[PDB]
Amino acid sequence: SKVTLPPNYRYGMSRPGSLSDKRKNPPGTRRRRVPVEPISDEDWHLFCGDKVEILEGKDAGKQGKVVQVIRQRNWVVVEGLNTHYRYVGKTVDYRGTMIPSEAPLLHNQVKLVDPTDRKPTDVEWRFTEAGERVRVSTRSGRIIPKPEFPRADGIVPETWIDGPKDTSVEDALEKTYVPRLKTLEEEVMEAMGIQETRRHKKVYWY
Amino acid sequence: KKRFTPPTYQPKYK
Amino acid sequence: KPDKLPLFKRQYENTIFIGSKTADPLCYGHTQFHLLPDKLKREKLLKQNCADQIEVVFRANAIASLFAWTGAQAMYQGFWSEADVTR
Amino acid sequence: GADRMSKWTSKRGPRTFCKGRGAKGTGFHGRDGKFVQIKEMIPELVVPELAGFKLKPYVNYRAPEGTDTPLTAKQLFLETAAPAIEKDFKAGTFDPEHLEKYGFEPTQEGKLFQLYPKNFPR
Amino acid sequence: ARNVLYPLYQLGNPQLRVFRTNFFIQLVRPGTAQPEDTVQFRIPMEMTRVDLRNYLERIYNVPVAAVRTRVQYGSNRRRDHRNIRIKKPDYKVAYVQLALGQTFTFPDLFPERKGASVDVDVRDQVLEDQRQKHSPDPRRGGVPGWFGL
Amino acid sequence: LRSRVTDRYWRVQEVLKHARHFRGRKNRCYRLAVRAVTRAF
Amino acid sequence: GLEEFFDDPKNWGEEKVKSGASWTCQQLRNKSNEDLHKLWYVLLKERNMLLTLEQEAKRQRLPMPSPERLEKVVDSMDALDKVVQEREDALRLLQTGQEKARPGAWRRDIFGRIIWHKFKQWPIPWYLNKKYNRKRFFAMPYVERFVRMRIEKQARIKARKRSLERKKEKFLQEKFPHL
Amino acid sequence: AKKGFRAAYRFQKELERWRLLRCPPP
Amino acid sequence: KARGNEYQPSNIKRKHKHGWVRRLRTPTGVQVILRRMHKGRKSLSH
Amino acid sequence: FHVRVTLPPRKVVDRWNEKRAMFGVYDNIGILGNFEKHPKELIKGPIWLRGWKGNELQRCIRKKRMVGNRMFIDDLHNLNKRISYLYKHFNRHGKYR
RNA sequence: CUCGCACACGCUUACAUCAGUAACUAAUAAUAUACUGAUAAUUAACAACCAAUAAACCAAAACAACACUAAAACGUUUAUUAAUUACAUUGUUAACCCAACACAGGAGUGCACCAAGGAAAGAUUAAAAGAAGUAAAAGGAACUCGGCAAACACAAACCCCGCCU
RNA sequence: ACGAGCUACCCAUGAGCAGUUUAAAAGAACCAACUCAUCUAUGUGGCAAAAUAGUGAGAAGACUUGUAGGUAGAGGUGAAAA
RNA sequence: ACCAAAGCUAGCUCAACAUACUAAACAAAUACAAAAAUACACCAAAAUAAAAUAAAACAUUCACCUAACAUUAAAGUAUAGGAGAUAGAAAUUUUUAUCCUGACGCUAUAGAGAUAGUACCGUAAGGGAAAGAUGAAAGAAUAAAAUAAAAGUAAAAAAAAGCAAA
Ligand SMILES: [Mg+2]
Ligand SMILES: [Mg+2]
Ligand SMILES: [Mg+2]
Ligand SMILES: [Mg+2]
Ligand SMILES: [Mg+2]
Ligand SMILES: [Mg+2]
Ligand SMILES: [Mg+2]
Ligand SMILES: [Mg+2]
Ligand SMILES: [Mg+2]
Ligand SMILES: [Mg+2]
Ligand SMILES: [Mg+2]
Ligand SMILES: [Mg+2]
Ligand SMILES: [Mg+2]
Ligand SMILES: [Mg+2]
Ligand SMILES: [Mg+2]
Ligand SMILES: [Mg+2]
Ligand SMILES: [Mg+2]
Ligand SMILES: [Mg+2]
Ligand SMILES: [Mg+2]
Ligand SMILES: [Mg+2]
Ligand SMILES: [Mg+2]
Ligand SMILES: [Mg+2]
Ligand SMILES: [Mg+2]
Ligand SMILES: [Mg+2]
Ligand SMILES: [Mg+2]
Ligand SMILES: [Mg+2]
Ligand SMILES: [Mg+2]
Ligand SMILES: [Mg+2]
Ligand SMILES: [Mg+2]
Ligand SMILES: [Mg+2]
Ligand SMILES: [Mg+2]
Ligand SMILES: [Mg+2]
Ligand SMILES: [Mg+2]
Ligand SMILES: [Mg+2]
Ligand SMILES: [Mg+2]
Ligand SMILES: [Mg+2]
Ligand SMILES: [Mg+2]
Ligand SMILES: [Mg+2]
Ligand SMILES: [Mg+2]
Ligand SMILES: [Mg+2]
Ligand SMILES: [Mg+2]
Ligand SMILES: [Mg+2]
Ligand SMILES: [Mg+2]
Ligand SMILES: [Mg+2]
Ligand SMILES: [Mg+2]
């Protein structure tokens, strides 16, 4: 299932259907539109899970790993570099667990760094002779591998145990289709031995 | 002539 | 609740009738005969998958009809809730 | 006044307005006013035997998927009739006039489950 | 099945068969005290008594005896932020009375765990102790206790 | 080309400065101040 | 087998219940029609059980344990239905050549629009049908004016959408002078 | 929104005057 | 005597006077429906 | 009469962009070009207003005559009503007569 | 103090359970059938959809014995065809509808005049003026356009105009 | 173009009138339900854009009333009050 | 000190080019009382525009008035007109291909009515709105800074006498 959003919607690093986002922007609000630089999917070279460097901010020159990207506002966020401190445990007469949350950053402020020399580079998309599209650095002239990142589900295929209601891999990949010219209905009738002799009468369509 | 002025109700939204 | 039998409430004339008016000298009953309808036939119940209902329908018909007719006799004689029956 | 945006269902009218909710009919009206239900009009669920079925509603998580290749008429023909046509043409017995032996149905009015008129719901 | 075109029936036509049914039903706990042999389902609005009887007798092999259906109307009174009525969908409710004397009671699908209750009590006690130790000393009169001297 | 007056604040204040010491609403309301200031002059 | 509407009794109180991934179109196509027909009811039972669990969770005012199972089951059933529909469409294209499984015609109703009138199944021909005969598939001469208004309204909407998009592009170029 | 800079500058002068009248600098 | 209650509701009269079939049975009612469609009305008839 | 409390963003307008630098560059195309083209042909705009000038009534009349066969229904109706109103006002109303 | 129960028409969940009411609805509070959120609900036997083609058929309903005039809705049988085989579909809540309102108004029918429904007064004091009622010495229309209103009266007459309902 | 869901008049289909006096169901009489609205007093941004209280007329008929249909503005309908 | 005040965006407007013009959705149901799968029919219809106005009245007349021929002239000419108001050609002439298209148009009482033909108002045809503002981050609300500038109040009720001021 998917949620619908008004055209005048502002993205705030929160899930659109989440309670925090709902309380931040009620369904009856329409805020001023922020200018977002148009960057296409074929030109968005900032992925999730790769090491990047910070250009401007309090942590100038520091490097961190990207943990999330928001294409709507051209935002990229790194874990624990550009941080402001906030209290998460709030009660009537008790406080604590003051954690550093981190603010989002723009593509003009975050640029990819190659793992060879660990120095900032500019990334340009190139088409390899093998039929693959891999990012190629221009300052040094080297390819940057795709930063594989775990999915939000939290399960890795290397360690998975089948439950009572999961098919085995061999059963799932077993091929038993015989491509003949019979419908599913006819094949099921033949398989189960259901015999029907009489046929439908003339039916007019108009 | 029996001239009468019918009252006009305010819009319900306000 | 009685509504799950299912039973449904209705409002109309509530009468206590024996088969004849109170002026009838034959105010006592001897035997009733009740014919089951085509809806409650044995074959219909078997198709409906109600094998043990074949006797339940008879029991319900007998209980309801005989109670109604005996109570009509009693109230024709002059007995009611606060004048409970003596015979 | 009455509403106009609300749906005009059978709950919003008089006693004489008894509109169906979308269920298919299952019979007609008999002689003495009762409803005669036709057995053939009632759908019969063709439910298979799942006792010895070794498949589950979910697949293994490590099982690989495949590239999306939707089945087309060309692929179906290549799979079901192309080898037979090629073998018969090599043998020299191929008859262009008669194709009913290869699964081709010149007329759909004969068989039970017709394709264009769509005589079957599902 | 629903949202499909049933073939027209005429005298002598073949029996109508549905292979992959499109009907999905739910088993609900009755909100009112029902007899032991009555089971409450929420069924699609296109389903009939005969369809539900076949659905229960064939797919699940349940010896049903009676089926009674009604249509429950969803409320259309709640208004959106644009003063537009929001309608809860109508739904069909079916009561199925079993045949062979079987009695069905809706189970407790969320049994509370003693270990979970103990863990919750321990967490609550720890939170209360943390609040008590974070509470300022009345005798200090608002002077912070972080500084040594 | 839509033209609107943007110095109406100063236009009003130039008159209201001469009526600050009046009594009633003549020291606040511009409609009642312009008549009172003219009579004062 | 009325207990099939519920999960295993040992998983009733569990907060999270794990399950495998959803079925995919290639895996469904690899299977035969017998296995597809059986898997339809295999998924139907699980979908009914999950709907029962969701309704019970709503009734008890508790979160449903791992509600992604219902989404996975719905996706698997949709994939199976799509595979069966693709096979039926390919076979009917091979045998009859008709793209649509239901007869229809491009008609012009009294409102001037061009509609796709699907054909219904009747026991009598069209010229003997009381209900069908009083329908009108044609436009009277007074409908051309409203058709022209519809055309002009759509043209205005499209033109102002294009102007809005051009203005947005120009504003973005002015705001980000990266050239 | 009224287009113009003269009104904004004049009101900035007025705001500076009000601030000086409210908090006289030493 | 007292006015203001000139509307006595009845679904049969409502549908027979301002219904879809009533509108479409006459050329002028079709024009009314076309006008409502052009304006963009949510409900063309009762 | 409430006026804004913040400085508006000062527009950095340049006088040496392409349009401002080449404004009306071929205004003397005829005079300095051995006449073939009038300065009329350099005017870009509506078809009924290229190299022409008139008051509101004349402009409406010319628009109806030139592009009146391609106007929308309501646009043509509004143009006809405006033409009628302008005719009546100009030929029947005023002071100097 | 007594307009209550149900059905038809009408509104469509305003009905029920739990919880909350600082504020929003009640023209005020208490809290709640009228506000808020969550969850549930109206189960058919009652009601709706529920044969044609020809023929025999003058002889009212009013306790209908038999009649009056204004001449009166309401039906069986015979013959030919009526798929034939459990379980079809739909309405089942409410303190409710039409009057801008939680309006002293307008609302069909069957039952009884309470065995069912409700409360005229938020708390004081007992100024004027105002509305309603009760009683009043002697007089009894002397008031007033008029015996209007009121009354322990509630009767008999003479004209004008329309025959009369 | 839209309006006879109020109202004017018709067309179908139904329903009401209890008690008393009279060979009477007599466009008779008393008087209920019911239908109208004579007079007065309150009310006059009121309970009400026509009401409340008292008092009145009819109440087996040229009567009241439910449902549905018809007559539409250079017109309809009208026991004429334009 | 309350009430309050200020954003710059949503989007609109006018033209040019243009494929050549009733968008997307149309699984099922939709002109039975629309969204109700299923029975022996009947279907279709045309007949001038009128008037408000001008002629200071009003009777003949009254440009445009939902029918193509555009532009430069002939020309407001010949003509037609209670020969009044006004209406008004033609014969005959001119018009070189494409890009160079955006704005001395508006910025939430403006610009489309539009956040929308939606709420709401009418039996219906129909009429028809108002309502947005923090921030890079609110996954920074023991939240931070700018105005504290309208009318209306409070801080702070009034002391003979009078268009309230000089
Ligand atoms: Mg309405
Ligand atoms: Mg109904
Ligand atoms: Mg009803
Ligand atoms: Mg039956
Ligand atoms: Mg039912
Ligand atoms: Mg009204
Ligand atoms: Mg209502
Ligand atoms: Mg509630
Ligand atoms: Mg209150
Ligand atoms: Mg009820
Ligand atoms: Mg009181
Ligand atoms: Mg007094
Ligand atoms: Mg008094
Ligand atoms: Mg007295
Ligand atoms: Mg006295
Ligand atoms: Mg006197
Ligand atoms: Mg006197
Ligand atoms: Mg008197
Ligand atoms: Mg007397
Ligand atoms: Mg007297
Ligand atoms: Mg008389
Ligand atoms: Mg006489
Ligand atoms: Mg009518
Ligand atoms: Mg009528
Ligand atoms: Mg009588
Ligand atoms: Mg009489
Ligand atoms: Mg009265
Ligand atoms: Mg009195
Ligand atoms: Mg009376
Ligand atoms: Mg009388
Ligand atoms: Mg009399
Ligand atoms: Mg006239
Ligand atoms: Mg007339
Ligand atoms: Mg007269
Ligand atoms: Mg007169
Ligand atoms: Mg004139
Ligand atoms: Mg004049
Ligand atoms: Mg005159
Ligand atoms: Mg005149
Ligand atoms: Mg004219
Ligand atoms: Mg002449
Ligand atoms: Mg003259
Ligand atoms: Mg606006
Ligand atoms: Mg002030
Ligand atoms: Mg003085």
CATH number at residue I42: 1.10.287.3980
Query: Tokens 């206790």 sit at which residue?
Result: E145
How many other C-beta atoms are found inside a 10 Å radius of the C-beta of residue A5?
A: 11
* Cβ–Cβ gap A201/E10 under 8 Å: yes
Q: What CA–CA distance (Å, rounded) separates A144 from A126? A: 11
Between CA D113 and CA A185 the distance in angstroms is 8
Distance E108 CA to ligand 14 centre (A): 78
The distance from CA A133 to its chain's CA centroid, rounded to whole angstroms, is 19
Total domains in chain I come to: 1
E42 DSSP assignment: E
Instruction: Say which DSSP state G153 is in.
Output: H
Measured in angstroms, how far is the CA atom of residue E33 from the centroid of ligand 11?
Answer: 46
Question: What nucleotides of chain K have any atom within 7 angstroms of a protein Cβ?
Answer: 5-15, 36-51, 82-92, 97-100, 105-106, 110
The conformation of residue E57, written as its DSSP 8-state character, comes to I
G17 burial type by CB count under 10 A (0-12 exposed, 13-18 middle, 19+ buried): middle
The rounded distance, in Å, linking the Cα atoms of E120 and J95 is: 93
Tell me whether G2 touches chain I (CB under 8 Å): no
Through-space separation of residue D109 CA and nucleotide M34 C1' in angstroms: 34
CA dist., res. A28 & res. A183, Å (int):
51
- CA angle (G178 as vertex; G177, H4 as ends), nearest 5: 15
The domain locations on chain A are: 3-148
Is the separation of the CB atoms in C22 and E56 below 8 Å? Answer: no
Which residue's structure tokens are 């950053």? A105
Could you tell me which of E119, E72, E109 has the C-alpha nearest to residue G61? E109
C48: CB partners within 8 A, 6+ apart: E65, E66
Secondary structure E strands in chain D: 27-29, 35-37, 44-45
Domains and CATH numbers, chain E: 1-149 (3.30.70.330)
CA distances from I5 to A24, D1, D13, I2, I14 (A): 47, 11, 21, 8, 16
Ligand-binding site membership of D14 (annotated): yes
Residue D52 to chain A, least CA–CA distance (Å): 14
Q: Find the length of chain H.
A: 26
Cα D4 to Cα D1, D8, E72, E89, I20: the distances in Å are: 9, 9, 21, 18, 12
Identify the experimental approach: cryo-EM
E-only strand ranges, D5-115: 27-29, 35-37, 44-45
CA within 13 Å, CB half, G31: 24
Greatest Cα pair distance in chain E = 104
DSSP code per residue over I1-46 = ---S------HHHHHHHHSHHHHHTSHHHHHHHHHHHHHT-S-S--
Chain E residue with minimal CA distance to D50? E59
Burial of J92 (0-12, 13-18, 19+ CB in 10 A): exposed
Task: Judge if the upstream peptide bond of residue C6 is cis by omega within 30 degrees of 0.
Answer: yes
Residues in CB range of G164: below 8 A, 6 or more apart? none
> Token pair for residue E140?
């200090």
- For G114-141, what is the HEC assignment? EEEEECCEECCCHHHCHHHHCCCCCCCH
Query: Residues of chain E whose C-beta is under 8 A from some C-beta in G?
Result: 5, 7-8, 10, 19-21, 24-29, 39, 42, 59-62, 102, 104, 107-113
Whether the CB of D55 is below 8 Å from some CB of chain E: the reply is no
> DSSP per residue over H5-25, as a string?
SHHHHHHHHHHHHHHHHHS--
Across the interface, whether the CB atoms of C50 and E34 are under 8 A apart is answered no
Nearest chain E residue to D117 by CA distance is E7
CA of H13 to C1' of M143 (A): 31
Structural domain harbouring I6 = 1-46
Which residues 2-21 on chain H approach chain J with CB closer than 8 angstroms?
2, 4-5, 7-12, 15
Distances (CA, A) of E104 to C2, E35, E69: 19, 9, 19
Residue A54 CA to its chain's centroid (Å): 23
Which residues, listed in sequence order, are joined to residue E94 by a DSSP beta bridge? E41, E69
- Give the DSSP letter string of A4-32: ---SS----SS-TTSHHHHHHS-TT--PP
Query: A106 pairs with which residues across the strands?
Result: A75
DSSP lists the bridge partners of residue E17 as: D44
Between CA F38 and CA C8 the distance in angstroms is 88
